[PDB]
Design a protein around this ligand. Structure first.
Ligand code: MG
Ligand code: MG
Lengths: 117, 1180, 117
RNA sequence: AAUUUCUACUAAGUGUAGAUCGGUC
């Protein structure tokens, strides 16, 4: 019963983390849904939890294309995002905006999403 | 031409424009560094303390005058009062003598002992510094030196206290009409109780402990009443009636506790004394304080619940007391005492009129409308319905005292149920965890408690007559006056809590700014130039208020004229308004004897005075031409306004240094991104300085400047975000969402500071066409062949209803005002207020707090009636015709309409106020009807009781019998078909001419004489031909629709009678059972029902009459409900407004009979008989 | 360190709960702010952590008046709701839909909001 | 849901349509 709370407490912590990322994904889907296809930011795509308050800019698996075509995922009602145009088929569901063109990205881009429009 | 062209510039009307001033440049920095708004906020903070000190000096002045005053005429007022009056106008000398008492005591006020240094500036300069010997308060009074203007409303309020006006705020009405009457009543009760009590309890104990100077009995004589004219005499005298602490813990009792102590005959058999009222001069800030008042006032131990215990004990002994003299006041509540004991609202009225026709009415009843009027005023005049008189008005085995006793004990049982549900609120430890403006269930409890106790207050205060009555029972009224004033205290607690919870979350508290000057912006740019230190600059299309400073006031008027750029055009050319009292001082510092002898109030000496006024003057601009119209031309041509230039960078440097303050006069209509139609006051302020304004709208002195702080915090701002859709609320709008590029904050204008500028103006200061309005309206309506009338109806399924009729009686136009059409750039959007109000009432039905909902409904109705005021003014400008708004004074009640009485009072007040000076906003201000030549077609507002029968272009009509009448024939129901007995059922049937069945039309023809029916004097034709046509909705609310002829065939085939013969009346009178006559009177009553409505769902609503016209065709409103131009009313409400409009056409018909100098005395008030003659004859 | 995990684990559980209530508040705000002021649902309102998954319809502190005027909180960008008209000043920040009029109420009307449009 | 101030609003994008005075208690 000692090491049971290791995985129980880690399960609860990862649950709070993935719910924080889901709330930020809902808000970020609302603002990027409001943007008219040309003020869209360079953005990091993922299909995993990506924790923007603890984002580590050292992994070589990050790219910075311009997002477009925000739409629904209507069998579970989640946000989904296309990383390029419609005819590229790389639909992702965990995005984090970033400053800069690819191969390096600067820090966060916090609270400047509404400032882009 | 029209009639309204002769109604320009008749009299004068003053207005007050309101604007927003915002600082420009570094003026907010100079105000913040020079600390100017720290001397004015603390000055407005210390206003209440100086009010308390002036109340203390006024109380000391009252206790210095009234002490050394003896009286003479008091004994003749006391002795002749209780003489059981012997009216040959001998008690009129008592009344004029009472006027001599008022003029005696307020002659003692106004006459001597100062009174001239009492309402002026020196009362805070000399007397009150020497008086209140204390630096703290004396430093406050010296810190109000020089500003002796903020007290003039206080001084005008306190000067009405020392006068003869017989008002409840005056002191003479307090001492004479309130204290002396209970003093006489206590002398008579003392003479009834007058015996040796125990010969130690009054003369030995009370005299030695209390005063030890003289005796007790002399308090119940005439001249020692002077001794109770102070406050300490009232304190000693009520201390002897009530009790006194003896400056120890002895706690001696009074005389009423001795009457309780006597214990004679298990009734106590004796009246009790009344304590006298005091002199004239004797939390709504948090949440824990209001609940603490609710702790200490209304709990299970205070004076209020104990007074409910004593009033509840008083109505349990309500049988032992003699009911000979217990008076119930005639008013509204007497109807309630008929309803909750007897059958209906009008039962005691029928028994008293049965006493009235027992004397004043003979056989062969000649009952007209005027005998009913004298009977009605004779019922209005009594005011003294006792309980024995109501006992004689009852049937067998119906005790009024027992039914009233059980129902008032039922009401205090309801109070114990509300106190049963309210235990856990003030028990011991309630911490209100929400706000009090949010914790809804607590408010619901306090609301229910204060409403049950205040409703018991009204139903118990029905037992107070007019007073000054006959030998009224003092054994009942001795206890019932001691306990009622506590219940007046719960009336004030109700008003305080209700005035706490309905507060808006922002505030409008402000304070006047002087800028170190007790002369600040009095006039507008006179030759003073350094005391007023304020003027108006203009630049482009923005306006500015320039305020100088005391260090650089006089040296600021050195500014150059026309520069190369930047000219602030300043105002100049001041005014000398009404220069008549300035005029002869130039001339009189043959014609001199003419002026000093006063013979001018003349023609030739007037003309020599014209040439004398022209010759003896020629920096002024005068142009001269009996004496009254000539001084009208002096005041006319003593006005001129023009502008003078300046430089921009000079006064900008004056702003940057600190030698000048500038504010911007600016509202929403002065904005650059503003494209629509402006407000009206924007057109006043922009036409205040316009070129072709010859003097219609001119400035007035006394403009003020306020400063409002911020009441909302930044923590509680709320705002629709930018670049996101938000939904619209008007369901008649073809768009459903909107999206803006910016934010929209809720209550943005109450989160910052704001400068406010109040600028008074004056309209038509010099009238030109002066004539009486009413008589000229009657002359113009006499000499016109084709008038028009607007008929405005309060409505039942509507809110207002409009029917416009012509001079002959043909409906020109008819439409409802449920929805308002707004106009902008050709686009028209409707807004439906009836569904809006239905949604607000649906929200009120589920709120658990109906305190905020009723206030929102009242504010909604105020906005609605302002929109209706616009629509009525466009209708008057269109057809050019008088209004016929129903006279809201005849007492007529209805209780089914939506627009209630108070809202419609406000509507008629807004029509009078708008038609004082009526402006078409979208017109040229130089033509008629514009902003400078507005129409003046209604006199001022005086009171709601002066709304009677005439005001300019407005006629008040006593709506009587206009709702339920046939607009085609003129038939009205004058019968009374309620089933009460079988004998009057047979006489009802005996009165009928001939009840026959026609088979060719399948109808039950009721041809019928009225002359065997009572109260039929108002009718004209007297021979009517009724039928059973159509079907009627039987209301009960079960909504049972009933057809007519199948019901009479259902009742005649039943009970074994026939209907195929002729003259079946007698065969209808051959029955014996009760239910045939009961259901037959029911079918007669549904046959006479003319207005048919569901009153639930709004499917059908119609109006059908059983009488055929002179063409055979019946009237049914459903034939006219779907037409493009109906010639008759379409529903029940167009009938009402149509008939009211025909009443105005009757009065215009009465103007064509009299002569041109007799039109002023022509009576407009139509009776019932003349309206039924005009409605039954003048159709065709 | 034995009963320290009592308050730490309860702090984590209440943190995940209040983040669930924030996520449901954000999604519910978007769905209600889509509706045209007459298809809005009757709403239980509160100013405390309201749980739509563990709501107990037994306390006498619950009403059911119809919501309106969905807007933002300016400084904290939270969602606020008005439970009557605007001119009643009853702004609340924790709402939950329920089928029915006041007092005697039915369920909670789950995922039936989008069907109102 | 923006206002000199009030009421309904969103009415073509920092506003739209009407009403509106006084200083009081
Ligand atoms: Mg406008
Ligand atoms: Mg509003």
């Amino acid at each position: 019963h000692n090491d049971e709370m290791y995985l129980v407490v880690q399960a609860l912590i990862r649950a709070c983390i993935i719910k924080e990322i889901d709330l930020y994904t809902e808000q970020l889907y609302n603002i990027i849904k409001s943007l008219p296809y040309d003020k869209r930011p360079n953005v990091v795509y993922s299909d995993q939890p990506l924790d923007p308050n603890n984002l580590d800019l050292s992994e070589p698996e990050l790219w910075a294309e311009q997002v477009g075509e925000c739409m629904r995922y209507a069998h579970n009602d989640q946000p989904c995002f296309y990383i390029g145009s419609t005819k590229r088929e790389l639909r992702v569901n965990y995005i984090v905006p970033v400053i800069g063109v690819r191969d390096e990205i600067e820090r966060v881009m916090t609270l400047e999403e509404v400032r882009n429009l | 031409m029209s009639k309204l062209e002769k109604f320009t510039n008749c009299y004068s009307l003053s207005k007050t424009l309101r604007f927003k001033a915002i600082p420009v440049g570094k003026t907010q920095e100079n105000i913040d560094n020079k600390r100017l708004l720290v001397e004015d906020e603390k000055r407005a903070e210390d206003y209440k303390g100086v009010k308390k000190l002036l109340d203390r000096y006024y109380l000391s002045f009252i206790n210095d005058v009234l002490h050394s005053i003896k009286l003479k005429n008091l004994n003749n007022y006391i002795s002749l009062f209780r003489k059981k009056t012997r009216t040959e106008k001998e008690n009129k000398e008592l009344e004029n003598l009472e006027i001599n008492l008022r003029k005696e005591i307020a002659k003692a006020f106004k006459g001597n002992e100062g009174y001239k240094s009492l309402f002026k500036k020196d009362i805070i300069e000399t007397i009150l510094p020497e008086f209140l010997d204390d630096k703290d308060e004396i430093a406050l009074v010296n810190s109000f030196n020089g500003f002796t203007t903020a007290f003039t409303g206080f001084f005008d309020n306190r000067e009405n206290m020392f006068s003869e006006e017989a008002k409840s705020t005056s002191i003479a009405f307090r001492c004479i009409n309130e204290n002396l009457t209970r003093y006489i009543s206590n002398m008579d009760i003392f003479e009834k109780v007058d015996a040796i009590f125990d010969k130690h309890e009054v003369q030995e104990i009370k005299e030695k402990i209390l005063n030890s100077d003289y005796d007790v009995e002399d308090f119940f004589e005439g001249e020692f009443f002077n001794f109770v004219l102070t406050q300490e005499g009232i304190d000693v005298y009520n201390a002897i009636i009530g009790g006194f602490v003896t400056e120890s813990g002895e706690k001696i009792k009074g005389l009423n506790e001795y009457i309780n102590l006597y214990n004679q005959k298990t009734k106590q058999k004796l009246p009790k004394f009344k304590p006298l009222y005091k002199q004239v001069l004797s939390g709504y800030t948090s949440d824990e304080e209001v609940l603490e008042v609710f702790r200490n006032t209304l709990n299970k131990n205070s004076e209020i619940f104990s007074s409910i215990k004593k009033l509840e004990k008083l109505f349990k002994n309500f049988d032992e007391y003699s009911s000979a003299g217990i008076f119930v006041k005639n008013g509204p509540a007497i109807s309630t005492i008929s309803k909750d004991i007897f059958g209906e609202w009008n039962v005691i009225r029928d028994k008293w009129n049965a006493e009235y026709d027992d004397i004043h009415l003979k056989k062969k009843a000649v009952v007209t409308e005027k005998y009913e009027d004298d009977r009605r005023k004779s019922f209005k005049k009594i005011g003294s319905f006792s309980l024995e008189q109501l006992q004689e008005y009852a049937d067998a085995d119906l005790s009024v005292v027992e039914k009233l006793k059980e129902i008032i004990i039922q009401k205090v049982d309801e109070i114990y149920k509300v106190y049963g549900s309210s235990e856990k609120l003030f028990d011991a430890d309630f911490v209100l965890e929400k706000s009090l403006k949010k914790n809804d269930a607590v408010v619901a409890i306090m609301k229910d408690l204060l409403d049950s106790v205040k409703s018991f207050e009204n139903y118990i205060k029905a037992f107070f007559g007019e007073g000054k009555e006959t030998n009224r029972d003092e054994s009942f009224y001795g206890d019932f006056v001691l306990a009622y004033d506590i219940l007046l205290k719960v009336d004030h607690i109700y008003d305080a809590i209700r005035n706490y919870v309905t507060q808006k979350p922002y505030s409008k508290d402000k304070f006047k700014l002087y800028f170190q000057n007790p002369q600040f912006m009095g006039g507008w740019d006179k030759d003073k130039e350094t005391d007023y230190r304020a003027t108006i600059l203009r630049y482009g299309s923005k306006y500015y208020l320039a305020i100088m400073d005391k260090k650089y006031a006089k040296c600021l008027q050195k500014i150059d004229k026309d520069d190369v750029n930047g000219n602030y055009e300043k105002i100049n050319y001041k005014l000398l308004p009404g220069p008549n009292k300035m005029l002869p001082k130039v001339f009189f510092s043959d014609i001199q004897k003419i002026y000093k002898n006063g013979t001018f109030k003349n023609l030739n000496d007037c003309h020599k005075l014209i040439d004398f006024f022209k010759d003896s003057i020629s920096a002024y601009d005068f142009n001269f031409s009996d004496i009254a119209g000539f001084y009208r031309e002096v005041e006319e041509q003593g006005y001129k306004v023009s502008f003078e230039s300046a430089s921009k960078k000079e006064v900008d440097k004056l702003v940057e240094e600190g030698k000048l303050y500038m504010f911007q006069i600016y509202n929403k209509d002065f904005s650059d991104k503003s494209h629509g139609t402006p407000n009206l006051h924007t057109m006043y302020f922009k036409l205040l300085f316009d070129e072709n304004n010859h003097g219609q709208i001119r400035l007035s002195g006394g403009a003020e400047l306020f400063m409002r702080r911020a009441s909302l915090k930044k923590e509680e701002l709320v705002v629709h975000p930018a670049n996101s859709p938000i939904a619209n609320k008007n369901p008649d709008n073809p768009k459903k969402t909107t999206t803006l590029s910016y934010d929209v904050y809720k209550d943005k204008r109450f989160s910052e500071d704001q400068y406010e500028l109040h600028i008074p103006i004056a309209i038509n200061k010099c009238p030109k066409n002066i004539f009486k309005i009413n008589t000229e309206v009657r002359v113009l309506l006499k000499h016109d062949d084709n008038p028009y009338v607007i008929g405005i109806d309060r409505g039942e399924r509507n809110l207002l209803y409009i029917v416009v009729v012509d001079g002959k009686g043909n409906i020109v136009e008819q439409y409802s005002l449920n929805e308002i059409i707004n106009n902008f750039n050709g686009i028209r959007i409707k807004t439906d207020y009836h569904s809006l109000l239905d949604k607000k009432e649906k929200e009120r039905f589920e709120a658990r707090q109906n305190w905020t909902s009723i206030e929102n409904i009242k504010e909604l109705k105020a906005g609605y009636i302002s929109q209706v005021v616009h629509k009525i003014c466009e209708l008057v400008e269109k057809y050019d015709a008088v209004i016929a708004l129903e006279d809201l004074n005849s007492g007529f009640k209805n209780s089914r309409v939506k627009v209630e009485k108070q809202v419609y009072q406000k509507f008629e007040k807004m029509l009078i106020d708008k038609l004082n000076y009526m402006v078409d906003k979208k017109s040229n201000p130089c033509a008629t009807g514009g902003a400078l030549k507005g129409y003046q077609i209604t006199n001022k507002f005086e009171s709601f009781k002066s709304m009677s029968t005439q005001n300019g272009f407005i006629f008040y009509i006593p709506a009587w019998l206009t709702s339920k009448i046939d607009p085609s024939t003129g038939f009205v129901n004058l019968l009374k078909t309620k089933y009460t007995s079988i004998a009057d059922s047979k006489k009802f049937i005996s009165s009928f001419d001939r009840i026959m069945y026609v088979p060719e039309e399948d109808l039950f023809e009721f041809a019928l004489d009225y002359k065997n029916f009572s109260r039929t004097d108002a009718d004209y034709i007297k021979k009517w031909k009724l039928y059973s046509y159509g079907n009627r909705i039987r209301i009960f609310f079960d909504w049972e629709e009933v057809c007519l002829t199948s019901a009479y065939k259902e009742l005649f085939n039943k009970y074994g009678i026939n209907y195929q013969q002729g003259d079946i009346r007698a065969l209808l009178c051959e029955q014996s059972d009760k239910a045939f006559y009961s259901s037959f009177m029911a079918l007669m009553s549904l046959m006479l029902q003319m207005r048919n409505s569901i009153t639930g769902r709004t499917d059908v609503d119609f109006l059908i009459s059983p009488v055929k016209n002179s063409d055979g065709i019946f009237y049914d409103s459903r034939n006219y409900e779907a037409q493009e131009n109906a010639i008759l009313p379409k529903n029940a409400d167009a009938n009402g407004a149509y008939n009211i409009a025909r009443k105005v056409l009757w009065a215009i018909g009465q103007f064509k009979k009299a002569e041109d100098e007799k039109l002023d005395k022509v009576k407009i008030a139509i009776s019932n008989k003349e309206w039924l003659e005009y409605a039954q004859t003048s159709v065709k």
